[PDB]
Design an enzyme around this catalytic site. Sequence first.
Site, PDB file in Angstrom:
ATOM      1  CG  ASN A 192     -30.125  -4.248   0.611  1.00 31.74           C
ATOM      2  OD1 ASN A 192     -31.237  -4.790   0.312  1.00 31.74           O
ATOM      3  ND2 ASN A 192     -30.049  -2.983   1.172  1.00 31.74           N
ATOM      4  CB  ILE A 249     -23.130  -4.239  -1.863  1.00 29.82           C
ATOM      5  CG1 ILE A 249     -22.528  -2.916  -1.830  1.00 29.82           C
ATOM      6  CG2 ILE A 249     -24.314  -3.967  -2.519  1.00 29.82           C
ATOM      7  CD1 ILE A 249     -21.439  -2.961  -2.709  1.00 29.82           C
ATOM      8  CB  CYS A 250     -25.559  -8.661  -0.316  1.00 28.91           C
ATOM      9  SG  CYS A 250     -27.433  -8.593  -0.182  1.00 28.91           S
ATOM     10  CG  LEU A 251     -27.096  -6.273  -6.219  1.00 31.20           C
ATOM     11  CD1 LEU A 251     -28.412  -5.676  -5.940  1.00 31.20           C
ATOM     12  CD2 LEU A 251     -26.124  -5.402  -6.907  1.00 31.20           C
TER      13      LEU A 251
END
Lengths: 149, 152, 139, 142, 78, 74
Positions: free
Chosen positions: A78, A85-87
Amino acid sequence: AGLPRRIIKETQRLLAEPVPGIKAEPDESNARYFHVVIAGPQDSPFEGGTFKLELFLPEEYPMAAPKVRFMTKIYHPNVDKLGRICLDILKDKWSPALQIRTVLLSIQALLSAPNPDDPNDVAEQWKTNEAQAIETARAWTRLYAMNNI
Amino acid sequence: AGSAGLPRRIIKETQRLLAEPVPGIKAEPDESNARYFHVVIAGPQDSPFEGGTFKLELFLPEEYPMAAPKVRFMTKIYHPNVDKLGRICLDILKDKWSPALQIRTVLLSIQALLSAPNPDDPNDVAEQWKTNEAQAIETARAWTRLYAMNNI
Amino acid sequence: VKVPRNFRLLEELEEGQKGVGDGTVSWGLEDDEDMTLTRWTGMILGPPRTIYENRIYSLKIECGPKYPEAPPFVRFVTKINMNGVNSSNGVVDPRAISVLAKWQNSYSIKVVLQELRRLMMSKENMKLPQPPEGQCYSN
Amino acid sequence: TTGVKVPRNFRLLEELEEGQKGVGDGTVSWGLEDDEDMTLTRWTGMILGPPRTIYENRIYSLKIECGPKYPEAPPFVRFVTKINMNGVNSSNGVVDPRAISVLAKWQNSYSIKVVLQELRRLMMSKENMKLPQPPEGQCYSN
Amino acid sequence: DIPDYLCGKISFELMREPCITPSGITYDRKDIEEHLQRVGHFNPVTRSPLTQEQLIPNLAMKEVIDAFISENGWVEDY
Amino acid sequence: DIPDYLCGKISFELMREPCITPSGITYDRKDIEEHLQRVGHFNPVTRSPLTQEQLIPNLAMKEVIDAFISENGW
């Protein structure tokens, strides 16, 4: 700094008492801008290293999410080639009730809980070869994490 | 036997009342019984009950405040909502009663009734009130001298 | 509000994957590992009613540590005779290109890439004989 | 936690209503003497003869007095209608609260309705059943 | 000075116009009205579906606040 | 000093489990509750309609109380 109170207030509380592992600070004359350092979670593929990221509050915040980005390289399903950043809290899923401490936390759980059940290649790899990617991870942490300012 | 045993609500109401008393009403719990109150309402200026002063007496039943308190008049008065027994007619004493109201409120309505005699409940005092106002006043003004003058 | 170099670049980035559909101007990280996101490609189609007529012109653009406060460097891979396009090597003169020359921190890569495409239209250059198609700059 | 004693007046009002509302049978009954009487002191009651006894259907009628400590103390009761009955004085009809038990051990939980019925249970005691009365509907003089 | 319990779960200042929500959270009225057209018809904190009409004013707080603006006595609105 | 504001509107003392009502009125939970099964479905103060499903934990007045308690405990 001419600038919403909620922010000033989030700042003092973060400095006057920041977080097990994490260094955050604004930057002189970009008061919306924060340079930050996660500790390698103990017992985590990134253990060793220490991770440069940057955050910023955009004008619409807290309506909008805070923009966040790693500066350092890191294998992680991620984080991508540029550290996007993935989230969920970060894209769609954000509420204004949540805050910077909240996001600093979640990137940080995020290291030790890596989530591959996502999946991106590191997406593949990282699942299909679970301790096989941790060498990669560790190595990386080793090259990029340790001995950077 | 001590004094309380009593609900804390009641102690408190009691104590606000002695402290800031309604203007022109005296009211004071019975030293013997802490639920019964001795009331005296003075007859409201420009009402027909003006010169006098009127005894009433209030009580807390057990479920107060889920049940209204009891009031009645004990001097005799001529008025569409008090009967010859001093029973009082007030919605809040029947079923407009709410636990959010209280003794002070109850006293305040009752003196307002002394102001704003509500002729159509629908009784003969009421009749006579709507039919013949002048006499109706005269007559209260007079009872007020007969009985509600220096029960001192 | 002051958007700093990095996200502001990150903006253009994702931006640049949607487009202006309408074909023309277009753009790109030159290599996605480049966290500095220093170097970029551009891409501008011809004006019509012009010698430039749908031509695939690639540029490269560089943004240095101070952008978008400072202009970025732009230069041209695909050959072009065009006012202030050094025609030994494609480099663009910013004096001479008022977007660059008078540059604003509000500007960016779509902005400059578009403005040339205005200037290709310019009477200035819709004339001007061209190098033979898609041959171009050695380096 | 048990609790709360009703004062006199509002207890009276109640007996007031109960008193004019129902009643079991037409069997005993009470209401105020003067219904302009705010002091609520003086009442009237009435009782009929029970069956199977010499008192068989005459209608007695009584006078009640409630003083200031009612109902912590009992009320005074006398017969207006003449009766021959143990407890009642043959000259003036006055009930003697001694000797007559509901009166003699009063509860503050008691009431006129109760006394009335008690006088009547007693019109069945065997000591009282067959005694000769005075002529129907005379009243004690005064 | 502002205790926390007298603030936005979103503005982080002291509330001018408290509302409480179905699951029962208070926020200043201007703020959650915003969240509700900018971000979503759900609760900031619990995220149960949540509309603006479900908002109730929370006059108790309206008072604790005034209370305080007088006693402690600080910083301004109104 | 138990300022009036921190009081059951029925109960008149300090609120132990503050809940608030569509018209926006706060009660000690116990009371409002009695009130509803015993005097009927409606808001004691606004007479507006009302039931026990429609009561909401006013958590922010719990904190005002909470605070105020140790700081003064009565």
